[PDB]
């Protein structure tokens, strides 16, 4: 049950991961303070994620297993899929610039939604709290 609003609580190795991605210092710095919140709606295999931050306010729509295009809030463009792996949502992306692969994972640990990002042997964790 991914359903509902998840507000960021704590971050793990996040600026290091942003540094890895080639992201600008002030943009990393503000990205560390982003006040991110996800309001997730499942409508079958069609997922809508209202993504809300200090940078932006976006509705992300995606259907499980079908490639979509996503832009980071920094403008990094990515293309890829989210599949469900039992209890997880596993995103497999690739930048449109370099074509380097980005791996995302979404788990609900009780009342925690844990988001893990992996790029170039660098892993970052962002922990959200159920509102």
Domains within the chain, CATH numbers bracketed: 1-131 (2.40.128.20)
Backbone angles phi, psi at 121, to 5 degrees: 70, 20
Burial of 35 (0-12, 13-18, 19+ CB in 10 A): exposed
Backbone angles phi, psi at 19, to 5 degrees: -60, -40
Euclidean distance between CA atoms 125 and 10, whole angstroms: 8
Is 82 annotated in a binding site? The answer is: yes
Backbone angles phi, psi at 126, to 5 degrees: -120, 120
Is 56 annotated in a binding site? The answer is: no
Euclidean distance between CA atoms 36 and 27, whole angstroms: 15
- Of the CA atoms within 13 Å of residue 101, those in its CB half-sphere come to 5
Fill in the DSSP letter of residue 29. H
Q: Resolution in angstroms, to 1 decimal, for this deposition? A: 2.0
């Amino acid at each position: 049950a991914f359903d509902g609003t998840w507000k960021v609580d704590r971050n793990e190795n996040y600026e290091k991961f942003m540094e890895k991605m080639g992201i600008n210092v002030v943009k990393r710095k503000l990205g560390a303070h982003d006040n991110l919140k996800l309001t997730i709606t499942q409508e079958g295999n069609k997922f809508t994620v209202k993504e809300s931050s200090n940078f932006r306010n976006i509705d992300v729509v995606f259907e499980l297993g079908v490639d979509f295009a996503y832009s980071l809030a920094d403008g990094t463009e990515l293309t890829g899929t989210w599949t469900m792996e039992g209890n997880k949502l596993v995103g497999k992306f690739k930048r449109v610039d370099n074509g380097k692969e980005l791996i995302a994972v979404r788990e609900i640990s009780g009342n925690e939604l844990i988001q893990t990002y992996t790029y170039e042997g660098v892993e970052a964790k962002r922990i959200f709290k159920k509102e």
